[PDB]
């Protein structure tokens, strides 16, 4: 998570 988006889910 960084900026305004997620690329790695949990």
């Amino acid at each position: 998570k960084k900026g305004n988006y997620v690329v790695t889910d949990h």
Epitope: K1, K2, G3, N4, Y5, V6, V7, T8, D9
Partner: antibody
């Protein structure tokens, strides 16, 4: 070694639908986010959509919201772009792309590009 | 929506000369600037990622710098094989946005 293999696309009339496929190899697909970005004849690049590792988070350009859907099937190492209600403005070379880090959609590997023409 | 504008739109250099290409953003991007090189009939190739760092395998003659909204890409000692279109990309926020390229000829 990382390979993004694209297929689908073609020439369709306005209002039509098209599903683009991107099959990946060479890495654990579920550990990476993926995106589609398109290149128009003016050679400008425009981000279309991004999807997180498991598919729980998706992001779309305002230009394709309500018409395109990005999805992935992790068991098949495949990324998809379902296009519907296509318009001439969507004519572009579409690229399959991998986010280079666990936190960024900045692209490292790119597929070879799939032509879609809407006319 | 962060806009990226590149400059010059194109340039022609002689072999062994330095090229300087710029990309400015409309707002801060936490140094998440990326640079690509694209040759005819190929996808863009990743040269520089976030934090102005050269990708492994890319020649050390390529560099980038800048912070805030003002970023630079340079090729010291340009070679004929560097002909192509160079693109910047911010990856700080979605929508991810690109400049529309600087065309390089030798």
């Amino acid at each position: 070694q990382v390979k993004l293999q694209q297929s689908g696309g073609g020439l369709v009339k306005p209002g039509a639908s098209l599903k683009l496929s991107c099959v990946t190899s060479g890495f654990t697909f579920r550990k990476f986010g993926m995106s589609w970005v398109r290149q128009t004849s003016d050679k400008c690049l425009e981000w279309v959509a991004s999807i997180s590792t498991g598919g729980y988070n998706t992001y779309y350009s305002d230009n394709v919201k309500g018409r395109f859907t990005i999805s992935r099937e992790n068991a098949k190492n495949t990324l998809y772009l379902q296009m519907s209600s296509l318009k001439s403005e969507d004519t572009a070379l579409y690229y399959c792309t991998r986010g280079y880090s666990s936190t960024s959609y900045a692209m490292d590997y790119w597929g070879q590009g799939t032509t879609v023409t809407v006319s | 929506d962060i806009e990226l504008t590149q400059s010059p739109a194109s340039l022609s250099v002689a072999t062994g000369e330095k090229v300087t290409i710029r990309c400015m953003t409309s707002t801060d991007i936490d140094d998440d600037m990326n640079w690509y090189q694209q040759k005819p009939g190929e996808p863009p190739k990743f040269l520089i990622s976030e934090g102005n760092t050269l990708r492994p395998g890319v020649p050390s003659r390529f560099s980038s710098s800048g912070t805030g909204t003002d970023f630079v890409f340079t090729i010291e000692n340009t070679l004929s094989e560097d002909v192509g279109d160079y693109y910047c990309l911010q990856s700080f926020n979605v929508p991810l946005t690109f400049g529309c390229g600087t065309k390089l000829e030798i």
